[PDB]
Design a protein around this ligand. Structure first.
Ligand code: SF4
Ligand code: ZN
Ligand code: ZN
Ligand code: ZN
Lengths: 333, 131, 196, 135, 98
């Protein structure tokens, strides 16, 4: 809703916009360009211009609506998204949707800027419970798991190629993991995690990575057999509803996976993707859904139900099994 | 190798009751009809070109995970986990030691799957089990 | 004029060409190009006398790839005559093809299974076949050789021990050469065909 | 003035394909005006592009037909003999056997098919009026 | 043209039916012409895209266009779009150069 880049703004998908915008502003492109001007990596003039001017002087004092904000930014050739996000601390009143305050994926970053003692107002809150229930939910289909295997296979191939040319990149991250540093410390402010934290910030474990997923290859095997297990459960010929605890117990019995490694699936995957420095993440997008499932199901145990139904659309000639991780408690979020 | 026995080429369409089993030795798919015909009398060489490993009839088992490679990792992990059994309490709360121990076990499993140091890895596994 | 009709037509043409001779292709193709052909018309089309057409029609009727229909006719200026027409009944032809293919595959599978069994024995003189279990109760007092009950002569081992690979190759060749039939049958089963 | 203006294998195939009926074309008539055609017919038969009927006294080409199917020869003689050996089951009992074997039958047993007042005083005006029994 | 649901292939007309592909091409061109940026106050594309990362539970079939057994579209959405196109054509034609 705020992008002004002629190429990225034309994208029809919000996520695609994020992928392109991050690529031009992750900071990797700028560093690569500085190292070698001959590099053909592009940038975003709107984002670059913000560096010259100070944060406190991005916009003149006053109220800036979307229409007015876009007009000013276009004239001054600046990015409204970065200006608005970076000015949260300075703003006296901040207006944003419920998804920026109840959905942990796009709320942990924003919630850190708003003041604790601020007045909170919920307008048209008669449907808030739906947002809370829909924030900690997830649906996995047969296609999602199929792409997950493809992404895992591609991830393994990329890791091998990176190992052949230079393995020092992975060694440095492994040392940091052993030291106990998490994504927050490893990743810089400019960069963003590949997989947004699906669980609430307070439920994230603070201890170090278990170790089974410290190595690049061990985590890939951990990811691979987890995907296969989900594919096995899709073959059920009748509706099965079970609590997360039962799902974890059956998972462990068949393929040896514990609760704790699953809780770090989202965090570990982001680090691995960043280390591999993959220019394109089109294939790996599928792995994002699986990573979200592992953390959600391995973090919460009460108020969530896992339902697998062979028939997503009852009026279908061929069954299309779908497994839904649904949140029943609207007060958790 | 889509839905038929590579040996007898029995299609599922003509014989829907046909089922397949895999021996943990070389993870080679084969129909139960061929298993009864060949291995029932006694052990014999696997009926694939370029494969000569001797496999017993009783060792045959059904395949759970569709991916053959994942099946090998799980079965190897099952064997390793039987020998290696420890918990966080065993280390007296030392998380660093527990994490290092888990990493070593994963390395052992990875080596066994790829057979980089099968001779040395197997010897180390045997020593721990006896001890 | 659904594609299902064309698929069934292809199955019949391939089956006839692969499992029947040349004149069989001529007869069945004519009734496939023309939905119904009279006996006299079929003879004129292929220029084959009654005797030659005899075995072809009879054999194709036995496998039910063709059906017969006899009705009385009353020509305006001739004596009433009983005419014969030939046409294809797809539900029966498909069912007959499916069962026959299954039997051939099953027979080869049984032969392959049997060959792996112990050879056995047979008497050179009276040509009587003795199984391994049956011969083990006929060995002489010296425990040296098996003696035939009828001839009282030493038995000789049976052949086919080394044919194990031969039967497997035969089974492989059939399935490789029969794949189009399996694919056509799968497509036919997917859809529905009305009785003709 | 040949009956059929055919001199090359390509021309022969075009003529046979264009035939509206399945009536064959006599090689005796076709050979007229063509110095040699038996070799061409035999070569086409080997290629499995034309159906050929041959004499019995000695192998000699006769009426030929366009081949609308696949290869004329595609099965070993051993399998052909096995196909002949198998005897088809009873006409009515075939669907039952197929269902038991696990294969969906395309036919059904024919036996299952189903084959399917007092004196009227009002005199002078008895016939003019029609009977509107219902509405 | 009149929005009547396209029943199973009927007699129709041999010649006029050949223009169906051209008519569909014209409709696509008309839809592209009608499409234009909308005022942000009433814009609905941004509302659904305001949270691009949301991946909640998929809604039931009651909140999705009807589909057939084979999975193909029922065809009711096609006639509904025709109503929108016809109304938009009428309203846009009002704002002529004159
Ligand atoms: S920095 Fe702003 S203008 Fe540039 S691509 Fe990202 S959102 Fe668009
Ligand atoms: Zn087999
Ligand atoms: Zn083998
Ligand atoms: Zn004898």
């Amino acid at each position: 809703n705020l992008c002004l880049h002629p190429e990225v703004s034309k994208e029809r998908k919000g996520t695609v916009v994020d992928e392109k915008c991050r690529r031009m502003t992750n900071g990797q492109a700028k560093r690569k360009l500085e190292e070698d001007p001959e590099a053909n990596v592009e940038l975003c003039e709107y984002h670059e211009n913000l560096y010259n001017i100070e944060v406190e002087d991005y916009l003149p004092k006053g109220v800036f609506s979307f229409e007015k904000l876009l007009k000013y930014c276009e004239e001054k050739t600046l990015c409204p998204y970065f200006i608005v996000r970076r000015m949260i601390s300075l703003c006296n009143i901040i207006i944003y949707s419920y998804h920026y305050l109840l959905d942990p994926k796009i709320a942990e970053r924003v919630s850190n800027e708003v003041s604790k003692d601020s007045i909170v107002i919920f307008d048209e809150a008669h449907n808030i419970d739906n947002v809370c229930i829909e924030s900690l939910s997830l649906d996995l289909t047969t296609d999602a798991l199929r792409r997950a295997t493809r992404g895992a296979n591609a991830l393994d191939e990329r890791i091998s190629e990176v190992r052949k040319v230079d393995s020092q990149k992975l060694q440095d991250e492994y040392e940091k993991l052993v030291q106990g540093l998490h994504s927050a410390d490893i990743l810089t402010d400019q960069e963003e995690p590949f997989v947004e934290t699906p669980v609430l910030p307070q439920d994230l474990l603070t201890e170090a990575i278990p170790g089974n997923i410290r190595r690049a290859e061990h985590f890939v095997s951990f990811l691979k057999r987890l995907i296969e297990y989900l594919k096995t459960r899709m073959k059920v010929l009748h509706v099965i509803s079970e609590t997360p605890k039962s799902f974890l117990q059956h998972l462990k019995q068949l393929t040896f996976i514990e609760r704790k490694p699953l809780r770090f699936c989202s965090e570990r995957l982001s680090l691995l993707v960043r280390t591999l420095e993959v220019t394109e993440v089109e294939d790996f997008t599928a792995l994002k859904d699986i990573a979200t499932f592992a953390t959600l199901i391995s973090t919460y145990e009460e108020g969530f139900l896992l339902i697998i139904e062979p028939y997503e659309i009852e009026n279908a000639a061929v069954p299309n099994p779908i497994m839904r991780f649904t949140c029943l408690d609207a007060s958790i979020a | 190798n889509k839905d038929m026995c590579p040996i007898c080429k029995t299609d599922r369409y003509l014989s829907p009751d046909v089922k397949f089993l895999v021996n943990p030795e070389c993870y080679h798919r084969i129909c139960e009809s061929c298993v009864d015909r060949i291995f029932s009398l006694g052990p014999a060489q696997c009926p694939y070109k370029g494969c000569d490993k001797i496999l017993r009839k009783n060792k045959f088992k059904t395949q759970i995970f569709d991916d053959v490679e994942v099946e090998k990792e799980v079965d190897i992990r099952k064997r390793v986990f039987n020998v290696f059994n420890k918990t966080i309490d065993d280390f007296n709360g030392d998380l660093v030691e527990y994490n290092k121990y888990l990493e070593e076990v994963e390395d052992i499993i990875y080596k066994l799957d790829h057979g980089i140091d099968v001779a040395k890895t197997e010897e180390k596994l045997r020593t721990y089990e006896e001890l | 004029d659904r594609p299902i009709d064309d698929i069934v037509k292809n199955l019949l043409k391939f089956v006839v060409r692969g499992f029947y001779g040349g004149s069989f292709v001529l007869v069945l193709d004519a009734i496939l190009f023309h939905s119904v052909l009279a006996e006299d018309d079929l003879k004129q089309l292929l220029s084959i006398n009654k005797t030659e057409l005899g075995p072809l029609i009879a054999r194709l009727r036995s496998d039910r790839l063709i059906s017969i229909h006899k009705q009385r006719e009353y020509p305006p200026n001739s004596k009433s005559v009983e005419r014969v027409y030939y046409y294809v009944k797809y539900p029966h032809a498909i069912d007959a093809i499916k069962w026959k293919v299954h039997q051939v595959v099953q027979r080869l599978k049984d032969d392959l299974d049997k060959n792996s069994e112990p050879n056995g024995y047979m008497c050179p003189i009276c040509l009587t076949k003795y199984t391994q279990l049956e011969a083990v109760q006929l060995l002489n007092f010296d425990r040296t050789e098996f003696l035939c009950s009828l001839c009282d002569e030493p038995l000789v081992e049976d052949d086919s021990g080394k044919k194990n690979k031969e039967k497997q190759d035969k089974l492989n060749r059939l399935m490789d050469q029969i794949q189009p039939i399996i694919d056509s049958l799968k497509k036919i089963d997917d859809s529905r065909i009305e009785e003709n | 003035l040949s009956t059929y203006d055919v001199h090359s294998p390509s021309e022969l195939l075009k003529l046979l394909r264009s035939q509206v009926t399945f009536k064959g074309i006599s090689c005796k008539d076709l050979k007229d005006g063509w110095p040699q055609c038996d070799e061409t017919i035999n070569q086409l038969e080997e290629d499995s592009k034309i159906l050929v009927l041959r004499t019995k006294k000695d192998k000699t080409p006769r009426y030929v037909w366009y081949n609308s199917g696949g290869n004329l020869k595609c099965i070993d003689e051993e399998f052909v003999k096995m196909w002949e050996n198998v005897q088809l089951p009873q006409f009515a009992e075939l669907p039952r056997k197929l269902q038991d074997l696990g294969l969906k039958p395309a036919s059904v047993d024919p036996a299952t098919i189903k084959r399917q007042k007092g004196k009227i005083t009002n005199t002078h005006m008895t016939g003019i009026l029609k009977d509107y029994s219902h509405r | 043209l009149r929005g009547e649901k396209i029943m199973q292939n009927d007699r129709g007309d041999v010649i006029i039916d050949r223009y169906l592909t051209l008519d569909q091409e014209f409709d696509r061109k008309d839809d592209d012409m009608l499409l234009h940026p909308v005022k942000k106050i009433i814009d609905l594309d941004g509302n659904i895209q305001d949270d691009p990362v949301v991946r909640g539970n998929r809604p039931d079939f009651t909140m999705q266009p009807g589909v057939d057994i084979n999975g193909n579209s029922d065809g009711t959405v096609d006639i509904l779009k025709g109503m929108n196109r016809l109304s938009e054509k009428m309203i846009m034609a009002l704002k002529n150069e004159y």
